Motif scaffolding. Structure first.
Motif, mmCIF file in Angstrom:
data_model
loop_
_atom_site.group_PDB
_atom_site.id
_atom_site.type_symbol
_atom_site.label_atom_id
_atom_site.label_comp_id
_atom_site.label_asym_id
_atom_site.label_seq_id
_atom_site.Cartn_x
_atom_site.Cartn_y
_atom_site.Cartn_z
ATOM 1 N N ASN A 86 47.037 27.900 23.228
ATOM 2 C CA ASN A 86 47.029 26.527 23.462
ATOM 3 C C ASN A 86 45.872 25.800 23.018
ATOM 4 O OD1 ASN A 86 49.304 26.533 24.918
ATOM 5 N ND2 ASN A 86 48.314 26.608 27.085
ATOM 6 N N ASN A 87 45.826 24.520 22.338
ATOM 7 C CA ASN A 87 44.872 23.620 22.062
ATOM 8 C C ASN A 87 44.483 22.722 22.972
ATOM 9 O OD1 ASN A 87 44.732 24.704 19.044
ATOM 10 N ND2 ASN A 87 46.713 23.905 19.086
ATOM 11 N N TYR A 88 43.987 23.410 23.929
ATOM 12 C CA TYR A 88 43.541 22.614 25.126
ATOM 13 C C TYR A 88 43.145 23.531 26.427
ATOM 14 C CZ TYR A 88 47.998 23.359 27.605
ATOM 15 O OH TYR A 88 49.278 23.884 28.273
ATOM 16 N N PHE A 171 38.487 20.002 32.203
ATOM 17 C CA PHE A 171 39.306 19.637 31.181
ATOM 18 C C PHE A 171 38.739 19.748 29.830
ATOM 19 C CE2 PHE A 171 41.813 16.446 28.480
ATOM 20 C CZ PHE A 171 42.843 17.325 28.085
ATOM 21 N N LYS A 172 39.044 20.676 28.878
ATOM 22 C CA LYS A 172 38.632 20.681 27.641
ATOM 23 C C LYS A 172 39.807 20.533 26.771
ATOM 24 C CE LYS A 172 34.243 23.209 26.776
ATOM 25 N NZ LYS A 172 33.649 24.666 26.496
ATOM 26 N N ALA A 173 39.667 19.396 25.552
ATOM 27 C CA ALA A 173 40.639 19.171 24.755
ATOM 28 C C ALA A 173 39.951 18.457 23.568
ATOM 29 C CB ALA A 173 41.819 18.588 25.327
ATOM 30 N N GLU A 174 40.650 18.442 22.404
ATOM 31 C CA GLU A 174 40.244 17.687 21.123
ATOM 32 C C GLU A 174 41.259 16.830 20.871
ATOM 33 O OE1 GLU A 174 39.042 18.463 16.494
ATOM 34 O OE2 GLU A 174 39.048 20.384 17.920
ATOM 35 N N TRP A 175 40.737 15.542 20.384
ATOM 36 C CA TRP A 175 41.792 14.514 19.898
ATOM 37 C C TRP A 175 42.616 15.081 18.619
ATOM 38 C CZ3 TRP A 175 42.978 11.631 23.396
ATOM 39 C CH2 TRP A 175 42.357 10.603 24.332
ATOM 40 N N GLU A 176 43.722 14.496 18.255
ATOM 41 C CA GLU A 176 44.494 14.711 16.939
ATOM 42 C C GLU A 176 44.001 13.905 16.048
ATOM 43 O OE1 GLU A 176 46.319 16.571 15.396
ATOM 44 O OE2 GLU A 176 48.439 16.143 15.693
ATOM 45 N N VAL A 226 45.168 17.747 20.395
ATOM 46 C CA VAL A 226 45.728 18.564 19.062
ATOM 47 C C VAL A 226 46.995 19.314 19.054
ATOM 48 C CG1 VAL A 226 45.010 20.366 17.247
ATOM 49 C CG2 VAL A 226 43.228 19.356 18.833
ATOM 50 N N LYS A 227 47.905 18.893 17.905
ATOM 51 C CA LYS A 227 49.346 19.373 17.891
ATOM 52 C C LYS A 227 50.174 18.396 18.855
ATOM 53 C CE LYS A 227 48.637 24.121 16.019
ATOM 54 N NZ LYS A 227 49.182 25.473 16.148
ATOM 55 N N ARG A 228 49.552 17.752 19.390
ATOM 56 C CA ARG A 228 50.353 16.895 20.666
ATOM 57 C C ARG A 228 50.877 17.438 21.638
ATOM 58 N NH1 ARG A 228 54.906 12.192 18.631
ATOM 59 N NH2 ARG A 228 54.736 11.061 20.463
ATOM 60 N N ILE A 352 46.734 12.021 31.682
ATOM 61 C CA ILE A 352 46.853 12.923 30.615
ATOM 62 C C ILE A 352 48.111 13.898 30.728
ATOM 63 C CG2 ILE A 352 45.859 15.139 29.776
ATOM 64 C CD1 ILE A 352 43.160 13.754 30.649
ATOM 65 N N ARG A 353 48.945 13.781 30.031
ATOM 66 C CA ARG A 353 50.388 14.534 30.202
ATOM 67 C C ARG A 353 50.620 15.758 29.465
ATOM 68 N NH1 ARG A 353 56.207 12.003 29.058
ATOM 69 N NH2 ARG A 353 55.391 12.322 26.910
ATOM 70 N N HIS A 354 51.231 16.795 29.913
ATOM 71 C CA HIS A 354 51.451 17.804 29.229
ATOM 72 C C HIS A 354 52.964 17.590 28.544
ATOM 73 C CE1 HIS A 354 53.749 21.824 28.885
ATOM 74 N NE2 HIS A 354 52.624 22.050 28.147
ATOM 75 N N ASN A 355 52.998 17.129 27.344
ATOM 76 C CA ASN A 355 54.416 16.592 26.597
ATOM 77 C C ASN A 355 55.658 17.387 26.834
ATOM 78 O OD1 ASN A 355 52.933 13.887 26.030
ATOM 79 N ND2 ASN A 355 51.797 15.103 24.361
ATOM 80 N N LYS A 356 55.480 18.624 26.594
ATOM 81 C CA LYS A 356 56.695 19.330 26.590
ATOM 82 C C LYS A 356 57.567 19.406 27.605
ATOM 83 C CE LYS A 356 59.765 22.314 24.746
ATOM 84 N NZ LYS A 356 60.479 22.207 23.338
#
Length: 371
Positions: A86-88, A171-176, A226-228, A352-356
């Motif tokens: 996971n990229n987050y 929460f840890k995550a990086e922008w696309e 990242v990776k949306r 902040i949503r988890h897209n899938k």
């Protein structure tokens, strides 16, 4: 499977309701919470509830309208969110702390371990509330990468205390596409029409999914991480057309059916955006008791509570439900760095949503710079 579409649906629904209960209280402060953290943690206690104690929870949490499917979907969402590639990062700290003298049921211990990879801890509340408190605050801090210490205050743990449902999240995550440090500058953020406040305002010229809802007087952007895999949606009122924040119309019409409809609206399209997004770090901490009892969850907090899914006798009630989430919006995403005009300088709703799976992880209204 579909077992996890229900859990996601119940969350997005839970989200708006929870927002609506809070919003009617304080119309002038930031509202920010993690509906996934809150819901997933009450699931631990719902798992242990019987009769109408269990029913009131399932109803406010949206698990049912009037069980297995819910715990099953939660497990598979927890499994998905904790993948290694996971990229987050969701540094989540959900746990229930029960008094040492309560006889917990083995079945609950193995059911809790299966669906949640979480199990009830026995601390001596009775004669050592502070040793229990410090012990809990230490676990919550080590699970949230030190970002959340002192979750429980001294007034939250007494000799009385029987059960504490802690639920924190970092929460840890990086922008696309991330902002450029050099382009961040100080700019006014409009609280009201009359009053404003400076903030570090980030900026970039780039393409994003944007929905132009003219009939409802707002515009919405999708900012993928990242990776949306994860995205943050921001709903901006076309402008401040209110006696206060400018969101009075969006809140007075807030709905989850709508929310998700706009999120995946085929009417949302790639657009080159002149984007101004303020830096902010939200670390909202909410004692959820009264808020939950207002939402319909009564019995779980009374002497009439029935948590005999975890204990042998009907003598266990929830004492504290303490939530806290830490999310930053910066240049890289959650961290700082080393043509349609989309200028976010007035109050806005976001999530902040988890897209899938379409699970809302965080939701709030930013209106009021804490700095």
């Amino acid at each position: 499977e579909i077992s996890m579409e229900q859990v996601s649906a119940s969350i997005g629904n839970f989200t708006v309701d929870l927002f609506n209960k809070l919003n009617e209280t304080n119309r002038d402060k930031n509202i920010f919470f993690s509906p996934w953290s809150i819901s997933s943690a009450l699931a631990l206690t719902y798992l242990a509830a019987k009769g109408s104690t269990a029913r009131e929870m399932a109803e406010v949490l949206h698990f049912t309208e009037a069980a297995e499917n819910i715990h099953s979907g939660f497990k598979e969402l927890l499994t998905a969110f904790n993948k290694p590639r996971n990229n987050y990062s969701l540094r989540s700290a959900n746990r229930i702390y029960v008094e040492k003298t309560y006889a917990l049921l083995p079945t609950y211990l193995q059911l809790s371990k299966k669906y949640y990879k979480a199990e009830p801890q026995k601390v001596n509340f009775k004669t050592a509330p502070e040793q229990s408190r410090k012990e809990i605050n230490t676990w919550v801090e080590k699970q949230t990468e030190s970002k959340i210490k002192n979750l429980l205050s001294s007034d939250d743990v007494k000799a009385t205390t029987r059960l504490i449902l802690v639920n924190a999240i970092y929460f840890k995550a990086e922008w696309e596409v991330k902002f450029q440090a050099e382009k961040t500058s100080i700019q006014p953020f409009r609280l009201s029409k009359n009053k404003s406040k400076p903030v570090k305002m980030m900026y970039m010229r780039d393409t994003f999914p944007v929905l132009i809802m003219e009939k409802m007087n707002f515009k919405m952007i999708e900012l993928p991480y990242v990776k949306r895999e994860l995205s943050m949606f921001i709903l901006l009122p076309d402008d401040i057309k209110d006696g206060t924040t400018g969101l009075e119309q969006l809140e007075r019409e807030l709905t989850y059916e709508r929310l998700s409809e706009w999120a995946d609206s085929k009417m949302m399209t790639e657009t080159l955006v002149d984007l101004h997004l303020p830096k902010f770090s939200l670390e909202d901490r909410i004692d959820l008791r009264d808020t939950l009892r207002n939402m319909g969850m009564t019995t779980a907090f009374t002497t009439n509570a029935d948590f005999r899914g975890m204990t042998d006798k009907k003598d266990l009630a929830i004492s504290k439900v303490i939530h806290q989430s830490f999310v930053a919006v910066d240049e890289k995403g959650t961290e700082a760095a080393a043509v349609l005009k989309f200028k976010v300088d007035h109050p806005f709703h976001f999530f902040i949503r988890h897209n899938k799976s379409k699970t809302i992880l965080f939701f709030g209204r930013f209106c009021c710079p804490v700095e």
